[PDB]
Amino acid sequence: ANATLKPLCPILEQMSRLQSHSATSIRYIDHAAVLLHGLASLLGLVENGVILFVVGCRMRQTVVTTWVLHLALSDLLASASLPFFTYFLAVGHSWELGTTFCKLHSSIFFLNMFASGFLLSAISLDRCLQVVRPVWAQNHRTVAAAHKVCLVLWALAVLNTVPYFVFRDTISRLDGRIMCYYNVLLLNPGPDRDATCNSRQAALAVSKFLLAFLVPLAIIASSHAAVSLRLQHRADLGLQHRNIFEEKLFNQDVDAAVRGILRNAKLKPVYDSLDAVRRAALINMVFQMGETGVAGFTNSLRMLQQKRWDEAAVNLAKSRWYNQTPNRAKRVITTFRTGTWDAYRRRPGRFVRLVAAVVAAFALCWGPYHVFSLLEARAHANPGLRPLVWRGLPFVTSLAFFNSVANPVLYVLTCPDMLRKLRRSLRTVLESVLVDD
Ligand X SMILES: CCCCC[C@@](C)(O)/C=C/[C@H]1C(=O)C[C@H](O)[C@@H]1C/C=C\CCCC(=O)O
Residues at the site binding ligand X, with contacts judged by CB under 6 A: 85, 88, 95, 106, 109, 179-181, 373, 393-394, 397
Stretch in the footprint of Na ion (CB under 5 A) among 115-123, 176-184, 323-331, 373-381: 115-123
Q: Which is nearer to ligand X, 95 or 411 (CB)?
A: 95
Q: Which is nearer to Na ion, 12 or 44 (CB)?
A: 44
| 372/90 Cα distance (integer angstroms) | 24
Q: How far is the CB of 349 from ligand X (least distance, A)?
A: 36
Q: Which is nearer to ligand X, 154 or 209 (CB)?
A: 209
| 52/58 Cα distance (integer angstroms) | 10
**How many residues bind Na ion, per CB under 5 A?**
3
Q: Which is nearer to ligand X, 106 or 121 (CB)?
A: 106
Stretch in the footprint of Na ion (CB under 5 A) among 47-55, 116-124, 267-275, 339-347: 116-124
Three-state secondary-structure class, residue 169: strand
Q: Which of residues 36-75 bind Na ion (CB under 5 A)?
A: 74-75
Angle, nearest 10°, between helix axes 143-160 and 63-90? 30
| 367/213 Cα distance (integer angstroms) | 8
**Among Na ion, ligand X, none, what binds residue 106 when CB lies within 5 to 8 Å by partner kind?**
ligand X
- Phi and psi at 266, nearest 5°, equal -70, -25
Q: Which is nearer to ligand X, 69 or 180 (CB)?
A: 180
Angle 131-132-136 (CA atoms, 0-180°, nearest 5)? 95
| 209/369 Cα distance (integer angstroms) | 9
> Strand ranges (DSSP E) for 53-189?
168-172, 178-182
**Among ligand X, Na ion, none, what binds residue 109 when CB lies within 5 to 8 Å by partner kind?**
ligand X
Angle, nearest 10°, between helix axes 100-132 and 63-90? 160
Q: Which is nearer to ligand X, 18 or 426 (CB)?
A: 18
Q: How far is the CB of 192 from ligand X (least distance, A)?
A: 23
Q: List CB contacts of 178: < 8 A, sequence separation 6 or more.
A: 94, 95, 96, 170, 171, 172
Stretch in the footprint of Na ion (CB under 5 A) among 37-45, 113-121, 170-178, 259-267: 113-121
Torsion of CA 243, 249, 253, 259, to 10 degrees: -160
User: Which DSSP string do the residues of 19-55 spell out, in sequence order?
Assistant: -SSSSS------HHHHHHHHHHHHHHHHHHHHHHHHH
Q: How far is the CB of 343 from ligand X (least distance, A)?
A: 49
79 binds Na ion (CB under 5 A): no
DSSP 185: G
Candidate list 106, 116, 284, 288; residue touching Na ion; CB under 5 A: 116
Three-state secondary-structure class, residue 193: helix
Q: How many CB atoms lie within 10 A of CB 148?
A: 12
Q: How far is the CB of 361 from Na ion (least distance, A)?
A: 9
124 binds Na ion (CB under 5 A): no
Q: Which is nearer to Na ion, 116 or 139 (CB)?
A: 116
Q: Which is nearer to ligand X, 106 or 124 (CB)?
A: 106
147, 66 in Cβ contact below 8 A? yes
**Among Na ion, ligand X, none, what binds residue 116 when CB lies within 5 to 8 Å by partner kind?**
Na ion
**Among Na ion, ligand X, none, what binds residue 75 when CB lies within 5 to 8 Å by partner kind?**
Na ion
Q: How far is the CB of 90 from Na ion (least distance, A)?
A: 26
Stretch in the footprint of Na ion (CB under 5 A) among 28-36, 55-63, 91-99, 108-116: 108-116
Half-sphere exposure in the Cβ direction for 188 (13 Å, CA): 2
Closest CA to 170 of 91, 108, 106, 126: 106
Q: Which is nearer to Na ion, 167 or 401 (CB)?
A: 401
81 binds Na ion (CB under 5 A): no
Q: How far is the CB of 123 from ligand X (least distance, A)?
A: 25
| 202/196 Cα distance (integer angstroms) | 10
288 binds Na ion (CB under 5 A): no
- Cα-trace Rg, the chain: 28
User: Which DSSP string do the residues of 297-330 spell out, in sequence order?
Assistant: -HHHHHHHHTT-HHHHHHHHHTSHHHHHSHHHHH
**Among Na ion, ligand X, none, what binds residue 74 when CB lies within 5 to 8 Å by partner kind?**
Na ion
Q: How far is the CB of 54 from ligand X (least distance, A)?
A: 29
Q: How far is the CB of 398 from ligand X (least distance, A)?
A: 9
Which residues bind to Na ion, rule: CB under 5 A?
74-75, 116
